[PDB]
Design an enzyme around this catalytic site. Structure first.
Site, PDB file in Angstrom:
ATOM      1  N   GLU B 165       0.801  -1.226   0.000  1.00 60.03           N
ATOM      2  CA  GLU B 165       0.000   0.000   0.000  1.00 60.03           C
ATOM      3  C   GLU B 165       0.834   1.277   0.000  1.00 60.03           C
ATOM      4  OE1 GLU B 165      -3.520  -1.519   2.885  1.00 60.03           O
ATOM      5  OE2 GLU B 165      -3.950   0.435   1.979  1.00 60.03           O
ATOM      6  N   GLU B 365      -5.045  -9.001   2.228  1.00 60.56           N
ATOM      7  CA  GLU B 365      -5.365  -8.688   3.613  1.00 60.56           C
ATOM      8  C   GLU B 365      -6.879  -8.656   3.796  1.00 60.56           C
ATOM      9  OE1 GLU B 365      -3.408  -5.348   5.614  1.00 60.56           O
ATOM     10  OE2 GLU B 365      -1.597  -5.649   4.408  1.00 60.56           O
TER      11      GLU B 365
END
Lengths: 461, 461
Positions: B165, B365
């Site tokens: 990210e 995730e």
């Protein structure tokens, strides 16, 4: 210029609870539990769960201590790591394995092991169940833990200690709030001092029943710091009299002479706070004095009359007879709050020689704690701790005068080898010859480490 | 009842900074420095220095993750541990040996490694020297670091990720103060977003130059949560349009399509805040798209019109075009303040399918954090985290709707395997299938852990 007897031991002192960290430890001691529930009572919320990482890095840490001139290392075995069931002292296999690893590793690095059994680390569960050291049954469980240590490690450990400073357990747990459970109760404190002297004598007895070689010996580690009266005023002299009986003789006399100090028993009785003892217990104390004494010395104790009459309506405390005194012009370890007075070393030595049969003894702790040592780093990350070298020189000079006068002192152990966790003060003040960077657990000799190695080579300075 | 494709990968995700501890690590990353500097910014002053002790206990921790059904473990290599000299990417031999041990230990426990190169852990010295991710020089040094990773570990690792990210690094370091150095500068943020995109394409280029097997692939991990409009009121839909171009297309399009979103470039140019690119850089971005996509989803995302016009006299921020919106009637996880909306998974699966070539992808995730899980211990010591199981049931069910309609989803990685350190939140919330008592670093499977294991064997529920 200042030399020491042949065979004099140069060592370092720590404890298990302040070095290992809590990795995989079965039980919480009172400090572990204190930190788990009130982390705010510790400097920066740094508690004992990692400490100086000795559980994981013992082999290399011992090599660094050997580099620093540590010929003998004194640390402690945690009741809460060694024992599975406290009632029967059944064994935690992983904890036995760990203490055999570090003792074997000490030997492989040519460090003589000195093993203390207890250093402020009562299991919290025994406090919850029996009120801890108030319980003569907890005393028995301690002896059974000691017995296991002797049977497990006695084959390659000659030098043992029952306790580090039982007086600090009494003061800390039952008088002034220094230790969880932070009970504030004078009479209980009197019973706890009794119970711990009794535990030590019962451990000495079991030690000699189990010993195999003549050079195996067991002792105890105490503060013997003298109580100096503020003035020759009779009220200040009387305060110093009681402060001396209560802070030194309370443990020194039963451990070494076999009996409690006569004038103290009489005062405790008159005040209605005497311990509960039995003739059988007193006979055990009389028959099993320690083989040797460890003296922890940091600062003097000065004392004047109490502000109010001891017959005032107040809860009984040993402090109703004396108040601490600040001497103008005293030398001070300031970022720490302690007076620096090396001459007390000489007084202690003379006192042991004249009054305690000149029993074999060592300085088991002497050290100076300093804050923010990053400011004294040099170009290679070596702390320039000349203050620590000068502090050691001043006290060793005083020690050597006591030895030349004939006192049977046999060793000097610095507090400490590697910076370790100082209870609620955590790592605010550093004491080690070896700095620990606690974010990375990377350790490096200080300047004092190389001085110490050289001191041991010349047996003097 | 709800089944999954043949060969679906059932995994867990963490990162190095959140698990290893800083034991013996050569350099501080920005979080290391931040905690060393301002421990008050961290819950209970619990920093990264021990974390979940993975540096010392990796081999047994991987065994427990295997019991919990983790077939692939995704974690990260720390730039600040592996590399000695950042300028040359010279190797720290103890850090090299450590990653060799965990990768070998993963293999022996039948866990397929998934290695990510960067999880918010910029070395602080590179921010001091060059202002970090704002430096196209730092972009090169990172590629050199990635080079070294591929040569040392590429023989045993098939699955790689450039970044976890990058948007969170942009948002955290340069927009809202979540990450040290807490810069608040919109225009700088735009350039850092560009630079990290360019770092990733360059890493993908290098990775394929140094490839040895065809199975070796490299991807990027992003949050692709939709920006749901509050209503059909034209100011709301236009806000959702920029929110999506900015929070998702900024990285999706360079990563998968090899170019930046045209409407976004137009917008930033109009506002005079657009990054500095070169045609060669843009060509490397165009020539090296990722091989796969990891998707992170936890909670939905809703936006409404900004309160004041974007033309107002204010520092440029992406938020001048959209405001977060709370939907009346939302299903909430109240203690954490998060909306629960599992079908967002199904919308993501459809977007990749339709618009991004149905590129192979995994849920990298997904998980649920809960505080004070000691409340759900049975006295056998196992957390009864039935809430975690229901959370996974809902989201796997929506993900199944996406795979069934043709989305090329290949794996589901839970956050997290073992409770790990959640930056400034530290251990306040727990996400693991396995519980960590961080006082003792003693780890124990939760109820969900056995559930996840049976899910993998049955390949459904």
């Amino acid at each position: 210029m200042v030399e020491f007897p042949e065979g004099f031991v140069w060592g370092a002192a720590t404890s298990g609870p302040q070095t290992e960290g809590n990795f995989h430890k079965q039980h919480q001691n009172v400090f572990d539990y204190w930190f788990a529930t009130e982390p705010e009572q510790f400097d920066a919320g740094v508690g004992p769960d990692t400490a100086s990482n000795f559980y994981n890095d013992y082999d290399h840490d011992l090599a660094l201590m050997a580099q620093a001139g540590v010929q003998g290392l004194r640390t402690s075995i945690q009741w809460t790591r060694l024992i599975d069931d406290f009632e029967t002292a059944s064994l935690n296999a992983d904890g036995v394995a760990f203490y055999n690893h570090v003792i074997d590793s000490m030997l492989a690095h040519h460090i003589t092991p000195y093993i203390n059994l207890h250093h402020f680390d009562l299991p919290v569960a025994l406090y919850d169940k029996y009120h801890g050291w108030e319980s003569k049954h907890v005393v028995e469980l301690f002896v059974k833990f000691a017995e296991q240590c002797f049977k497990l490690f006695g084959d390659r450990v000659d030098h043992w200690y029952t306790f580090n400073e039982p007086k600090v357990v009494v003061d800390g747990q039952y008088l002034y709030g220094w230790h969880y459970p932070q009970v504030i109760n004078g009479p209980k404190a009197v019973q706890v001092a009794y119970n711990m002297n009794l535990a030590s004598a019962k451990t000495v007895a079991r030690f000699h029943e189990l010993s195999v070689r003549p050079e195996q010996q067991i002792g105890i580690i105490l503060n013997l710091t003298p109580a100096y009266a503020a003035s020759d005023d009779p009220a200040d002299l009387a305060a110093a009299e009681f402060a001396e009986l209560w802070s030194n003789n309370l443990f020194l006399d039963p451990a070494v002479l076999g009996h409690f100090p006569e004038k103290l028993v009489e005062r405790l009785t008159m005040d209605g706070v005497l311990w509960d003892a039995t003739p059988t217990e007193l006979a055990i104390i009389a028959a099993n004095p320690v083989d040797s004494l460890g003296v922890n010395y940091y600062h003097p104790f000065r004392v004047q009359r109490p502000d109010i009459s001891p017959k005032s309506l107040q809860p009984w405390m040993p402090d109703i007879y004396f108040k601490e005194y600040d001497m103008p012009g005293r030398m001070m370890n300031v970022d720490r709050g302690w007076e620096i007075y090396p001459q007390a070393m000489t007084d202690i030595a003379r006192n042991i020689q004249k009054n305690y049969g000149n029993i074999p003894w060592m300085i088991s702790e002497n050290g100076m704690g300093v804050a923010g040592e990053e400011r004294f780093l040099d170009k290679q990350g070596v702390v320039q701790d000349d203050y620590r070298i000068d502090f050691m020189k001043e006290h060793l000079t005083a020690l050597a005068k006591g030895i030349a006068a004939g006192s049977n002192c046999q060793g000097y152990f610095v507090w400490s080898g590697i910076d370790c966790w100082s209870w609620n003060h955590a790592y605010h003040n550093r004491y080690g010859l070896i700095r620990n960077d606690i974010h990375t657990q990377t350790k490096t000799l200080k300047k004092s480490a190389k001085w110490f190695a050289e001191l041991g080579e010349r047996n003097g300075f």
